[PDB]
Design an enzyme around this catalytic site. Structure first.
Site, PDB file in Angstrom:
ATOM      1  CB  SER D 181      47.340 -31.229  39.415  1.00 31.27           C
ATOM      2  OG  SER D 181      46.386 -30.497  38.850  1.00 31.27           O
ATOM      3  CD  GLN D 182      42.598 -36.625  38.509  1.00 26.83           C
ATOM      4  OE1 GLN D 182      41.390 -36.343  38.191  1.00 26.83           O
ATOM      5  NE2 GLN D 182      43.422 -37.225  38.228  1.00 26.83           N
ATOM      6  CG  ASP D 269      49.485 -23.320  39.044  1.00 25.11           C
ATOM      7  OD1 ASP D 269      48.562 -23.488  38.163  1.00 25.11           O
ATOM      8  OD2 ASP D 269      49.757 -24.474  39.697  1.00 25.11           O
TER       9      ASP D 269
END
Lengths: 317, 317, 317, 317, 317, 317
Positions: D181-182, D269
């Site tokens: 993710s990040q 997602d």
């Protein structure tokens, strides 16, 4: 859902002081007099339905405010007289006028009329809307007992009993009143206001102990009242609203019920909280029974269906 | 929320076929004639409010069906004549009669009347309930154009304009009609039915392109129609309901609007879906502008407030 | 939502022990000294807005940490001096700098400045982020009173009062501080730390009784603190965080307020639970009033708007 | 949740036009020069943890803006040199500095540093907050590429690699960069900006194709950008915001990645929509692989853990 | 809920390729042979119920794997032979064995048996659990057609027909199979595998077009399959699971149905998406009708009850 | 979520009366004798996994009812003997047989076997389904202690210990049993029924104080029992079910545990409510510790991972 209201031990003792005003009896005497002013003029029209052994009709009659009230009337297709039931539907819960349920009750041996509640299921409401109200019917005309929505509907319920009692195929001594939720309240209110019903069955009755209901209910429709106070914030308005509500509250009408009555509540019911239903039950002074279901809320309770079939059979068949 | 309706490129071209029946004009001519039959008989009563530079009144008047319509009327506390606004509130969204907003509009320099929508915010509805309807006002009297809820309210909106135009402190040539959602529809309908308003401002107007609305809306209250069809399953009922709705649909009334109009929509609006609002906009043939806000739904849009203040200032102040 | 916190009878008596550390007064004296070190250097720039009778400006000034604080300043377009208001916005709730509300307050006759809270609405925050924190501003710099987010903010609020007091069109003896939620806390904190405000109005104030708040709130943003502890589980971190929070808690600052104050709470408020707001109120020792609204939560309360307009009129106009 | 984005066939072809401005390369050259100006000055302090065969340290170093960056560094307790990994945590998803994961990676044979993302997990952010932003870090300093939150973060990630490369126990030729993710975005950004990493593993990378992300994401945190636009409605603000974001967008940085890279996406997602991740993947021109998981969203994907362990083993062990 | 699946025009033409393996017929021939190996050995025991005109019994019989299957059997209390119904209940939706519904069907004139589905309602399941499965019955034994949960239940349904056909009070030529959802699939599967039923009624049938169902369903229980693939990620497991499912899929069994059949779907059904039900319908080659209800989902459809009562009356009474 | 159960002060004292029937010990003696009847016949097969320093195997063995139980067994790749762990997974929470966690435990130095719970994760369940049950495993065979789902499971756990104890690379005196939720109950149950484990770690154990759990749990899976009672309303069924459950309830088994045990609970846990876990803890009479986490629910608790690693290191490494 999970248990959220008073414990069972406290529920059994919960009997809130009556909120009835000094003119409670007088209001109902006057209201019944206004009903009597209106000639019933009932009409019956046969209605084709795919069932053997039952005849179905559309019934109409005139009631309070010269409102034409309607519903299906299903009769066992055999020689009478028959025991009868007037069945009252739930709040905003009438689909195709409950015709399938009504026919099924006739198949069980009961001449049964499903009164459609004015404005909801399919009957006329001639009463004007005097001013603002919250979305729904709960606060329509709430600033006066004379204009309140349920005045007309309680009177319609009494008139239903007067009409079906007049039918030659109906045994006037074996009439029952039944319903769940709103329908349970109408059943109790009808029995409180009328001699005609022999017996009452009420699943988790609505319109009971309003002052507590507004503080404990977690779902509609009691919360329409809360909605109304949000929109109309004058303290005087809240006072007036609860004053008018008291004339229709089952805790005040319950004491007039002389008929054997059977009631049900589910302990996780978020619509008609158990305390509100115990409040109504505990103000009854009659042959009474309350069936308590730990794992059910505001919904069909299979175990209670058997209880109510046995009870109606015992008293009416 | 997130984008869900037609893309912006498609929205700009969305102009559904009008659903207006052959007697559309005649129905409104007849309805206006019935309104004219009722003498307005307006009353004004001063109302104490904690503000300097504005006088507030309770205004009442008689309208269609001899219904007493009410609302607050706030006037700048200085020598007139003043430009004026009739402000229409949202569906079930009138709290304490919108008094604070009405006063604020008067502080901006407009003699402003907040018409309370019959049965919702605080006006009388004399029209009978002919039969069953879904919870709410959207399907009340839906089986006939003559009985439908919004017939009375559209006529009340016209009458509001007739009453405020008659006031000596009001400049009859500088009257605007404004509102959001239900209020926006009443603003547009009022301008379509009346010469009196100079200008129209409608935030995300409701009551538009009903046949699409029922298939695309994700929130109340368009879905009351869906609720109604679930309860009343006769195919003839659905036909009849959409027939009556067509007489009140903004896609059919929009073509009558000759006033400069300003409208707003948010592209994530789930209550009044963008397609339904573009439909109304695209049927206007007048000096018009539609402000589109990507990141807003059915809610106060700060940027549009500045647009609407500028627009009213330009045309009225 | 329904009633969830202490009963009204218990709320009225709820007065938690103060959590103020021995150096509470000294911390605020030191912090005000650091503020005084920064020259205000205010600037005013006219800002076009579609309103008659009000002039609007963008105001900036320098505050704690040499942060440039900003907001709109609206003044009645007539000869002064004017009473004034500093308005503080809600947590993460500033849309287009609250310009429309600010203008409306000026239309009611108050020279009003809407201070934008550093980092949220549109002011600079020069203070460093010393380490990790939960999503939001509530735990930024929470491991020291010197670094905590609200230190700079509270000081900005004091500086706002110092700046508007210096304006020649403002009557320094008729300044009020107002706000809801975060804004209500800033109002109370400003009055506690400054002589300048004559009067305080605080809708359901935030930043009060933190140690109970984190156990009773059902909605953000008090729960950012819970989030922080989840991510940083050292028991010494929790101790330290509550230590620093105590310096900003309204139960500790309230005793310093000498101004007449008016407060509101809704009994179903899940953001600023009633107990936390009663805690702040019950530590006030001043001319005070708390308006209690049974049917409202963390939201605009129409009835309270009339109360607050009357209160400001009484004390300032 | 179910499938909501482009079909797999369309996803494979989705390659949006780069949004990189003409000074893209120059901005990063300048930013890396400003990093270079700050001497790293790393410190190591042993940290007790209940594990055999691994030594754990607290690592700090100085980075952009003289910010002190921190995290746990775990080393296999045996003679080196060791392959290494810099692990980047998810958005607001660092609990107790990810110590258990970091130790586990060291047990797999990697000297691993979990860089704490400034302000989130436990590192200092010296960069000022220039003005208003939405709740969170996504819009902090968004009105300029020079002030934007991720500028310092991206540079911290590069500096992390420079610091661990300098350690004598680390084989400089066998360093990997990993994260979800990040963290996946930081891994890709670090590899784009630095020669040091040999390989890259990115689970469903964030910070990619912002202009689509804002229109398709159904969960936070991309929607902070939407939130920001809601509060700051100037069209010139939206333009400026997307301009600044373009400098940090993986679709513009991906083309600089020369390392073998392994990525994952789940087709349901809602946080990092498949289209945004495919967009990043399709702009890579390197030895690459994208593992697609039909039944997973933004979460741990067990099958991918085996893929990533095999990939790191192949390239580093 | 709103419209989400294919448009009505597309639904009418949706006929997915059959997924039947080459040994599809052989598998069912072999399975029916294994059933025939088990002697039925039925037992009847009278059961007291509060109804006049119907006698109720508990029926048991032996089926596949020597499992004892059970249910209530209600017969009209009059001279036969009677038409009969085997009624199949919904997935996890049997409350007190559906006794009230079963009695009501007998009151309509049908000797009716409500087969309890093994493990759910109240029958034995002797089949072992070969390995892991997702919560529920949908994936129990899913790695082989021989072990799959529905193999036993389909065979139980066939055996139900064989047993009620043997009763002297039953007219073997006038037997129907009915049910909704899971029950609709059992009705169709029973008719596909057996000559005995004259007619089929299936409300929104389940177990249809599995490969699409897993991608379009928005509620349980199709999503148990998705859950299973999350937990067991081997690509060969997904292949194998869809292979076994194909033997039970209505799109493969529908072609064997020779009886007149009536089906229903609601266009907002999120459990059995309209495409999956149209798929089953479009593979029927028999006297067939599909009633489509725009405003209903996976629920009781009052209008369809009248259709099904007429259909059963026409073919059986 | 927030605090909902008993206060911490009351939790510490909560010790419900044991529900164990007179034949509690005898039932377990008899059940262990039936286990002993089945020869284990374990098999080991090497399994490729991308890790250095650990060898992974698929282990199978025979258990109660001749069920083949399976799971991964990971061993440190060095000379033994090794301490060992039997790890038990959560309810319906086994993804790809927990292989990554199992390998990680072996990297920490423990020969570890993740027993797959019959029917859930990947082991055989030979026990028949005697009749109806609610969706899930909680009520499978609930009408008799002999048929109840957890009988075989508890016995599988004991057999797991017997099998790993027999391995020459395992130090029989340094075996621990661990798990969370369902896994914590299996750990405690295994230690209660078997001498083999030296130590127990149980995160928020399930299957504890059933009679309270059904009234206080707010999430699945305890509520399967409620679901079961809704479907099977006979009062005798509820009595029988709780009788059966008593044989498997940790409050009755806890007193047999002689091993040092470490437990955890989060105070906002809605799945295994704190009172149910304190109940189990307060019935232990052994070297025990309960770690209480105010801000966590039914989830991974990072702070507890360090506690459990230290505890296992202390007692086993």
């Amino acid at each position: 859902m999970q248990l959220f209201d008073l414990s069972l031990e406290e529920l059994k003792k919960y009997k809130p002081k009556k909120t009835a005003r000094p003119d409670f009896a007088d209001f109902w005497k006057k209201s019944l007099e206004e009903l009597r002013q209106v000639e019933a003029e009932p009409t019956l029209e046969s209605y084709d339905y795919p069932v053997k052994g039952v005849k179905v009709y559309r019934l109409t009659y005139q009631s309070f405010g010269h409102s034409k009230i309607e519903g299906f009337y299903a009769v066992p297709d055999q020689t009478g007289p028959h025991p009868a039931l007037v069945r009252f539907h739930g709040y905003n819960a009438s689909y195709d006028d409950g015709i399938h349920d009504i026919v099924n009750w006739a198949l069980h041996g009961y001449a049964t009329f499903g009164m459609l509640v004015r404005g909801q299921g399919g009957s006329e409401d001639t009463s004007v809307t005097p001013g603002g109200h919250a979305l729904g019917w709960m606060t329509k005309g709430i600033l006066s007992k004379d204009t309140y929505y349920y005045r007309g509907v309680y009177l319609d319920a009494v008139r239903a009993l007067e009409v079906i009692q007049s039918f030659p195929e109906v045994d006037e001594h074996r009439i029952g009143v039944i319903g769940g939720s709103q329908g349970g309240a109408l059943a109790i209110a009808a029995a409180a206001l009328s001699d005609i019903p022999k017996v009452v069955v009420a699943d988790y009755p609505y319109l009971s102990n309003f002052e507590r209901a507004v503080d404990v209910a977690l779902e509609q429709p009691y919360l329409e009242i809360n909605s109304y106070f949000r929109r109309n914030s004058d303290p005087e308005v809240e006072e007036k609203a609860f004053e008018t509500l008291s004339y229709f509250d089952l805790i005040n009408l319950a004491g007039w019920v002389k008929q054997p009555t059977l009631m049900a509540i589910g302990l996780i019911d978020q619509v008609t909280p158990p305390s509100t239903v115990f409040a109504a039950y505990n103000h009854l002074e009659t042959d009474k029974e309350l069936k308590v279901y730990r794992y059910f809320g505001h919904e069909f309770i299979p175990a209670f269906q058997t209880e109510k079939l046995s009870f109606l059979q015992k008293h009416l068949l």
